[PDB]
Write a protein that binds this DNA or RNA. Structure first.
Ligand SMILES: [Mg+2]
Ligand SMILES: [Mg+2]
Ligand SMILES: [Mg+2]
Ligand SMILES: [Mg+2]
Ligand SMILES: [Mg+2]
Ligand SMILES: [Mg+2]
Ligand SMILES: [Mg+2]
Ligand SMILES: [Mg+2]
Ligand SMILES: [Mg+2]
Ligand SMILES: [Mg+2]
Ligand SMILES: [Mg+2]
Ligand SMILES: [Mg+2]
Ligand SMILES: [Mg+2]
Ligand SMILES: [Mg+2]
Ligand SMILES: [Mg+2]
Ligand SMILES: [Zn+2]
Lengths: 451, 523, 81
RNA sequence: GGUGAAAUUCUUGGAUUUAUUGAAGACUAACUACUGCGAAAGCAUUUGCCAAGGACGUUUUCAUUAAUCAAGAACGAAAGUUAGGGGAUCGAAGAUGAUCAGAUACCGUCGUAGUCUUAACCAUAAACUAUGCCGACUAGGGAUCGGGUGGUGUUUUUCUUAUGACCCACUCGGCACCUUACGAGAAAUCAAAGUCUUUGGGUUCUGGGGGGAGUAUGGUCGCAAGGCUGAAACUUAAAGGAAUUG
RNA sequence: CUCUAACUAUAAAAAUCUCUCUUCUC
């Protein structure tokens, strides 16, 4: 019939008391056969009332059914598809307002506790999933997915649930499989990509480390399979998040390369300050120095080769090659503070432990004069400690323990215990650079590798 | 049905005699239940009205005790009988009614609570109504113990309320059970006939256990064996909850109820699952690591822990299978939320067991010694470690399994502080009834297993390493360290010069290459 | 058609046809051992039971009259034998 | 009004229509079909009661109790006859106004008995499917009605099972249908009108050219109308059936 | 290899008919 009479009858069913009759009536109006023949764009507000009472009610799968029938009634041209996309974005916005209402009820309930929202959250999340599954394989819907993605992303931000991301990601995977299954819109791929960027941004907006990294690896696969290069505006913070992941995740060379890429992306944005460039270069340089050496071909297959599939590279360089490449660069090398460069030249070339530690006592407090030393201490500290180990092995073999205990003792910001010293030496020996014989009858250490 | 229900209520209002009241209720209450028999759960107000006029039935019988069924001169009724015609005796063909009403209410209530959101307030008020259901159970038990006199008939008609007294009591602590009993006895100002004389004293502590054990003792005398197995499983349930673990293990060994349980229905197996996991948890409370290792090696060996234990919603079970016949079957055996034992606690207990049993032994296996480690425990922590070793992510922890695996990797590496820090970070331990002592025992055992795995790991690049310094830096008594070292040397016979007057080793002899060379030189 | 083996019809074809028209006039019915949800006893019932079969143990009528087979009582368990 | 055209007839006491009501008896529209029930006639608003029956289901019961059937019986459309009750409509008779050569016929208006009933006679109809009943077999196809079968079936909706309603593959029975002849017929046609000269399943009742004639007469039933039974004298070479061409 | 929409509106009267019917064989 008429949208206004439909709204009147839904209002009457609000009045008498039965809202499910309002839902069924609005379903009758929207899903009628004549909506196929009549222009769906003209009859918009019946769907709006359907949305209103559906929010009042608890029937989200019938919402999905009504929306899918209203698609099925208009499958030829773009006008009705834009109309249904608008009503779908309105539905997503309205259920997000309902989620805010449930949040304020939960806040009041918390105050009463001091002085089941999960049901409504599950209902609304399943409504989101039904909307997402419904809008698959349809082409001309463009702003529709953008609106749905944005409001769903707000939904994921407001509440903390890790299984919702898994469900959403796998369902998008199946949707892209279906889209491949039924292949004139080149914005769809970029739309999924931007959904992924919002996923990453919110996943790092609140206390997550693996969700964002999984979305990021999917983003890498999407870049490489597709043609277009993502937005530098969002890729800057995207690689900031990617750097946030590489703190303990494993290989630190990937952290160095990604933080280099963040420096590269920050080199052209309107917000450009040169002391920030100095600080970013110092951070990159200290992180690169913190990277642990890897000079020995391993046994069999080290399972740390699948990571380099995140930064477009496959060949395996060493830390020395990476730092030489950093030296070959210009943007970083013209902005690093000179004291860190001095300490670097102390660390690697002519790493005589006595003079290196003395220059550490000279330059470590000054290295903390600017707020950059807190970034990477532990791997750099382990590097200097392993350097003490290797230099002591090179120097002499016949020696007692306590001499090593005091020749390995480090200044305040990089110091450890004696058992820490022994355990670090033990696990550097487990790597099997040079085997050692450690006796304790007179507390002696002897480096024995027959040349 | 609804108009007939209203008509019977009208006739109850018109009726005057108590026997007419009881007959009208006997015609009406099952009509209401049949009007609410197709539904999953009944209207709360209508179900409470059925509860209330069932209690009305019981109270009016209490006003007409043993008189509506005339005395044993003629046990069947004598006066007007031509109209209903359904009067043959007054023993069990008419008396066997009210417990049926109670149990129908209880079945509908259980289906409702499984069909209600556990975290909602309506679930809590339904629990408050379950309190009244148990009080009605007690009132019905009192009335039925009053009615039947012959001990055979009394037993046959009164073991069922013993089962009911079990079914809604066993889980809570003794205090709240005493409170429930006192409240029920207050709700009945007058009636008092019981086999066990509860009203006389409610001031002792060894009373809930005594009452439940008396229920099991009285229950063991009737012919039904499945009910007897049910009662012994409930005894295990209660003992592993409150009493201790030694008694539960001893009566498990006394009852040997293992072979008749799977041939029967699934409820027996469900209760077996719950009591076995409960006793494993209690053994871990009493610091029995290898014991609960042996215990939980039955349910967690298989991948599924949802169906077998029975702790689940319906959406999470409606996707594993897609047919309607089992969607009402795969969910019918579901378990009440006021009964649940945390899956997180079970998983972290089993994972801690795997960490304490395997990692030192797997270190000894990797070192080169093969003398003892024959078996391969199903679904151990080694498979999780290998699967983690198979993937591309090696970063921060995500769940309880990740924290357990990282505690295992710190265990392997040589330290113990990261493992205990993760265990304190593992927040599945907030449900331990005993916190301080079990945490101290776990800390000491983490220390000792780290020291053992360090003994296994480094004996090749070492020729001498300290033992008392290890004890000081690992917080273990030195004598306990040397005793653990002697135990290890008995288990493996490691070639090593071990001393107490010296506290210094002499290890450089040879692990296995020398022995193979010796055997080849032999012949 | 035009050449068969009436001695050896296909068993699928054999049960396909109507009884009283097969090779040997055999009955379609069978006997089910039904247990009430209440009592664990086993009570035998003819598949197309006519009367309202009652378990002698308790008034728990298991199968109701119908044109075809008697309809069970939603709680019992039947075994083919 | 009414018709092909018109007149008779009612109408300023206002006929025709326009509304409300109320009375009577009538029938049960449209649902309504190659669909159902019954032995046939016949049966169509709703509801209750009364009894009955078919078909289906049945590892229920008896064991030839079976088929048709002279004699005997029960029903038996409409019209008709008694009597009593009702009396709308419609209409044999009659009265009319037309058409025509005549029209006391067809068209047109009024109108008696009937039409509807209540008990009793009447027992005939193109009471036709112009195919007697009970059996067995033989060819392809669909639907349809009644029952009962099996679905991992669909929507149903009461969350889900249960029903119901549908979809499929059935099967038993019923009205039927379509295609075909490889069977029949003289053909029209028939799935029986086949299984008939290669002549035999069991059984009743009818006809022997057409007229005379269902007439004469005698019975017999009926008040009456008339029904059942039922010829002959005599008169003729055709009557008749189906199809073909004009 | 996807489907089920249109439709109209006539009647007056006209009866009868004498013959003559004749082969197919090469
Ligand atoms: Mg007038
Ligand atoms: Mg009608
Ligand atoms: Mg019909
Ligand atoms: Mg006769
Ligand atoms: Mg008549
Ligand atoms: Mg005239
Ligand atoms: Mg006349
Ligand atoms: Mg006339
Ligand atoms: Mg007239
Ligand atoms: Mg006749
Ligand atoms: Mg003749
Ligand atoms: Mg004649
Ligand atoms: Mg005569
Ligand atoms: Mg002819
Ligand atoms: Mg003349
Ligand atoms: Zn029973």
């Amino acid at each position: 019939f008429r949208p206004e009479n439909a709204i009147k009858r839904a209002d009457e069913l609000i009045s008498v008391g039965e809202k499910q009759a309002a839902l069924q009536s609005l379903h009758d109006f929207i899903t009628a056969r004549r909506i196929r023949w009549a222009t769906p764009s003209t009859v918009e507000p019946v769907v709006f009332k359907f949305l209103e009472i559906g929010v009042e009610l608890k029937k989200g799968k019938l919402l999905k059914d009504g929306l899918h029938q209203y698609k099925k009634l208009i499958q030829g041209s773009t006008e009705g598809l834009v109309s249904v996309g608008a009503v779908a974005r309105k539905f997503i916005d309205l259920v997000e307002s309902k989620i805010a209402s449930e949040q304020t009820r939960a806040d009041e309930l918390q105050k009463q506790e001091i002085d089941a929202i999960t049901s409504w959250l599950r209902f609304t999340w399943e409504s989101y999933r039904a909307v997402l599954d419904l809008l698959r394989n349809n082409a001309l819907l463009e702003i529709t997915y953008s609106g749905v993605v944005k409001k769903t992303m707000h939904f994921c931000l407001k509440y903390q649930r890790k299984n919702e991301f898994k469900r959403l990601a796998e369902m998008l995977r199946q949707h892209l499989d279906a889209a491949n299954y039924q292949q004139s819109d080149a914005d769809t791929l970029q739309r999924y990509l931007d959904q992924r960027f919002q996923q990453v941004d919110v996943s790092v907006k609140l206390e997550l480390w693996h969700e964002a990294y999984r979305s990021i690896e999917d983003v890498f696969h999407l870049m490489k399979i597709s043609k277009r290069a993502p937005k530098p505006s969002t890729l800057a913070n995207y690689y900031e998040n990617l750097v946030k992941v590489f703190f303990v995740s494993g290989d630190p060379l990937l952290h160095t390369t990604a933080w280099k890429k963040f420096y590269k992306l920050y080199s052209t944005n309107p917000r450009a300050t040169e002391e920030e460039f100095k600080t970013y270069s110092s951070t990159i340089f200290l992180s690169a120095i913190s990277t642990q050496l890897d000079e020995i071909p391993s046994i069999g297959y080290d399972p740390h080769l699948r990571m380099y599939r995140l930064l477009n590279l496959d060949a395996k360089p060493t830390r020395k090659e990476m730092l030489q490449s950093i030296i070959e660069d210009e943007s970083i090398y013209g902005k690093v503070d000179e004291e860190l460069k001095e300490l670097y030249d102390i660390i690697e070339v002519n790493f005589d432990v006595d003079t290196v530690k003395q220059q550490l006592e000279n330059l470590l407090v000054k290295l903390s004069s600017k707020t950059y030393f807190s970034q990477y201490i532990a791997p750099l500290r382990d590097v200097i400690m392993r350097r003490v180990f290797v230099a002591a092995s090179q120097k002499f073999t016949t020696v007692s323990q306590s001499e090593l205990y005091k020749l390995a003792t480090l200044p305040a910001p990089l110091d450890l215990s004696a058992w820490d010293i022994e355990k670090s030496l033990l696990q550097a020996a487990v790597e099997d650079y040079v085997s050692i014989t450690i006796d304790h009858e007179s507390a002696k250490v002897t480096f024995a590798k027959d040349p | 049905q609804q108009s007939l229900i209203s008509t019977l209520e009208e006739l109850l209002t018109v009726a005057e005699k108590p026997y007419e009241f009881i007959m009208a209720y006997l015609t009406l209450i099952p009509s209401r239940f049949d009007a609410s028999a197709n539904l999953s759960y009944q209207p709360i107000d209508q179900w409470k009205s059925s509860f209330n006029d069932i209690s009305k039935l019981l109270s009016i019988l209490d006003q007409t005790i043993d008189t509506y069924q005339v005395n044993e001169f003629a046990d069947p009724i004598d006066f007007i009988e031509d109209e209903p015609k359904e009067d043959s005796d007054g023993v069990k063909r008419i008396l066997g009614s009210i417990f049926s009403f109670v149990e129908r209410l209880d079945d509908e209530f259980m289906k409702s609570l499984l069909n209600i959101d556990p975290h909602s307030s309506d679930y809590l008020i339904r629990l408050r109504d379950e309190q009244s259901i148990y009080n009605l159970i007690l009132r019905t038990q009192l009335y039925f113990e009053a009615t039947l006199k012959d001990e055979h008939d009394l037993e046959r008609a009164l073991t069922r309320p013993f089962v009911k007294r079990l079914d809604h009591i066993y889980y809570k602590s003794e205090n709240l059970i005493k409170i429930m009993e006192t409240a029920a006895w207050n709700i009945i100002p007058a009636q008092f006939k019981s086999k066990f004389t509860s009203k006389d004293q409610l001031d002792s502590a060894d009373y809930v256990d005594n009452l439940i054990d008396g229920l099991s003792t009285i229950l063991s005398k009737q012919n039904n064996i499945a009910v007897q197995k049910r009662a012994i499983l409930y005894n295990i349930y209660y003992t592993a909850l409150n009493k201790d673990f030694q008694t539960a293990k001893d009566m498990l060994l006394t009852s040997q109820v293992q072979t008749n349980i799977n041939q029967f229905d699934s409820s027996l197996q469900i209760l077996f699952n719950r009591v076995v996991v409960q006793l494993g948890l209690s053994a871990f409370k009493l610091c029995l690591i290898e014991e609960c290792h042996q215990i939980l090696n039955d349910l967690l060996s298989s991948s599924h822990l949802r169906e077998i234990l029975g702790q689940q919603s319906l959406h999470r079970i409606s996707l594993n299978s897609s047919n309607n016949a089992s969607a009402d079957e795969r969910a019918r055996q579901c378990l009440p939320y006021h009964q649940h034992i945390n899956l997180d606690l079970i998983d972290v207990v089993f994972l801690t067991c795997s960490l304490l049993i395997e990692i030192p032994r797997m270190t000894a296996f990797y070192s080169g010694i093969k003398v003892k480690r024959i078996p391969y425990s199903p679904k151990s922590i080694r498979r999780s470690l290998e699967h983690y070793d198979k993937l591309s992510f090696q970063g921060p922890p995500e769940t309880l399994r990740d924290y357990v695996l990282f505690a295992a990797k710190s265990m392997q590496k040589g330290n113990w502080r990261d493992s205990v820090k993760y265990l304190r970070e593992i927040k599945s331990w907030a449900l331990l009834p005993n916190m301080e002592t079990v945490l101290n025992s776990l800390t000491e055992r983490v220390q000792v297993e780290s020291l053992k795995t360090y003994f296994f790991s480094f004996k090749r690049f070492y020729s001498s390493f300290s033992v008392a310094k290890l004890a000081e830096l690992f917080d273990l008594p030195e004598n306990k360290v040397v005793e653990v070292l002697q135990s290890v040397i008995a288990e493996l016979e490691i070639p090593a010069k071990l001393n107490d007057e010296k506290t210094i080793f002499v290890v450089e002899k040879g692990d296995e290459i020398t022995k193979l060379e010796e055997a080849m030189v032999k012949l | 058609v035009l050449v068969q083996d009436l001695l050896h019809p296909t068993a699928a074809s054999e049960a396909r046809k109507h009884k009283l028209k097969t090779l040997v006039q055999s009955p379609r019915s069978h006997f089910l051992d039904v247990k009430c949800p209440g009592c664990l006893n086993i009570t035998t019932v003819f598949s197309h039971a006519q009367t309202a079969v009652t378990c002698e143990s308790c008034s728990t009528v298991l199968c109701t009259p119908t044109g075809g087979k008697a309809k069970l009582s939603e709680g019992t368990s039947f075994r083919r034998k």
